[PDB]
Design a protein around this ligand. Sequence first.
Ligand code: GDP
Ligand code: GDP
Lengths: 370, 369
Amino acid sequence: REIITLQLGQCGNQIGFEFWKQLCAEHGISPEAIVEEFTDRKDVFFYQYIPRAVLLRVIHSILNSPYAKLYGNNWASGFSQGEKIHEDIFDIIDREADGSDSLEGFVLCHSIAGGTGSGLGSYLLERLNDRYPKKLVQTYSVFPVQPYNSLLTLKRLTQNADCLVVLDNTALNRIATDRLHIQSFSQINQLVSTIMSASTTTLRYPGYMNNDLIGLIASLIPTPRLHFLMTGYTPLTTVLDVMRRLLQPKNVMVSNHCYIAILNIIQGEVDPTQVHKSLQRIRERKLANFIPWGPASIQVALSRKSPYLRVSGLMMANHTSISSLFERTCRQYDKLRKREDNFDEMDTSREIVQQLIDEYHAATRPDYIS
Amino acid sequence: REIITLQLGQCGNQIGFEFWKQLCAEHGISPEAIVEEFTDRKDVFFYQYIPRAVLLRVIHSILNSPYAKLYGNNWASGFSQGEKIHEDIFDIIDREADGSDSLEGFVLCHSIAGTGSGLGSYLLERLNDRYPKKLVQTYSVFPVQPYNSLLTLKRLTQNADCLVVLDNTALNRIATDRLHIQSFSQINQLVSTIMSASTTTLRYPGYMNNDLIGLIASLIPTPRLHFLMTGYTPLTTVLDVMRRLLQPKNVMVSNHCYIAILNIIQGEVDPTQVHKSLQRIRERKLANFIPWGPASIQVALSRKSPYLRVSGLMMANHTSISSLFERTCRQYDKLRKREDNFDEMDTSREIVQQLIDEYHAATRPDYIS
Ligand SMILES: Nc1nc2c(ncn2[C@@H]2O[C@H](COP(=O)(O)OP(=O)(O)O)[C@@H](O)[C@H]2O)c(=O)[nH]1
Ligand SMILES: Nc1nc2c(ncn2[C@@H]2O[C@H](COP(=O)(O)OP(=O)(O)O)[C@@H](O)[C@H]2O)c(=O)[nH]1
């Protein structure tokens, strides 16, 4: 099962580039797309090496980079341009689709901060559900007239994208000043590319459990509505050190409340005899709170680092606190609704997200059923 | 068994002149008709070396080309003048026939869109009179134009024992999509790639398909459904090539099902994963065939010329070729309501309707009777 990526706007093409650098570094792949001398299945992302990239100004500098051999501002205008090149761009997708053995998903790297890609992102997801109804789509959207373009794409992402990994630049810059002391764009993305790289540690390296993209998502997302995730990455030393440093709100990449499911990926060679002990100490101290209705647990799996390149770890969670972020956005909309052909699509968009904000607040009650 | 080819009209000359150039280089033959020193069977098309061609103001363009030592617009004008030189051009074909050991076919290259239309209609009629046992394959090219086009189809549906369609419209797309031309001097380069790779099994002898009648009788089941379309992917295993040939993006054509498929693999691919891919194509069901008769897919390998990497060509007998006719049939009636007997056009009109009905009847589970 092969995976293919799409990068839109200025943001998606930037972080996706460094995502291609860091991933190409994990394997023994020279910048010139040639294997050097110097186990790891490199066929899911690379096709004989050629990466399955689809890039939609900065592209000129991208080819000017040493990795050349590796291949308006409104929302409606971003949606219009996507319609003007409907068939022209789509041929690239189809020829890459069936030319591949068995497509599994569609990784989408894009921003919703008022860019032409933000609309461009809204269009592709509509058609991706039109043509291929049996193909999962994952999107690593990133959060910041900015209220407008933000709340609109949320209307499409809640019914087309079967998964989503949110990344807000606000909580990122807090990490930038504190533990890197920058006071730039190419500076914060250094850590962002790290999150995505380790996010697919269980895919590029074979393991027992979770050997496919449906193996990770099916456990966390309980319903096609509550389909929002957050990430964590602690190394910036035993197992009880990792999981305890992950649950802190100082590390989460997000600006009652409880968890639904957690996933912790350990990449080190740590002694696996103590992984159950760390699970006991986290329970007894009661450092995290779960749902009361159904039995919700925390899962951990192991894998191995790139031998070419120390204990790392990733935390993936579905927290109902993500509802607060939306409330920050939609509140700005009502304020911009009273201050400034039909303006009816903006109505149903505001309408459908307010159903989602109702769906989260209802999950925290012991009687969420019915 | 030798195959004497014919070239009519500006189209037939240009494709044939560039067909020979593709063949002369694929063998160790200098344009001076002299073998270069630098196994491949070359007697079918060449006579010990001279090509067996009978051409018919572009001729001067060939006589000035470095290959000089190798040899109106009405359909009625083509059929009329062809009758005035009945004895002239048949003197050449006859003297070229008996000089050959045992004649096998007449590969005729002409475009149905000026004089090549009316003259070719005359030849395909006259050949069946004198030569009743000679196959007549034609590499016809699809584009008053609706008139001259369909009139040739009257003859091409009862005389030509085979026909390979190559429409300029679908070619122009591939010229624009993957070549970005915007020219005749470029699209013919693709045509010459299709014509040369079509007879790769005759010039390179293998297990089977050592004669033209071996490639014909396999695909064409009945004397009427004798229209074939082509597919050429290289513009890597056998599964990579087989999957690309069945995509509608590669076919040179602008319910529906196949009748017979022949795959030509000109690579050095080991002959062990040939059955595995065919096994896989059946599983994923990338193509469907006729329900009435047993239809199977055939694959053939060959060897690339060392004097000149995996390629692939597919000979297809698809029912969707009936669509190209309807476009001609449609525009005819429009010109029939817009303006010594004018009966030949109506008689030709009837027989084309019999053909299209036969195609749409071929996709029925009761095509028999
Ligand atoms: N997280 C992150 N966001 C970025 C980066 N570069 C640009 N952005 C976001 O992209 C937005 C600008 O979009 P822009 O490039 O003008 O859209 P385009 O011109 O249509 O591609 C800003 O609001 C930024 O928040 C980056 O390196 N990291
Ligand atoms: N594919 C292809 N078709 C051609 C080329 N040259 C001419 N044709 C076709 O031939 C037709 C014109 O035929 P024409 O030369 O007038 O015939 P003539 O009256 O006997 O000279 C046009 O409709 C074209 O479609 C060529 O180089 N390639």
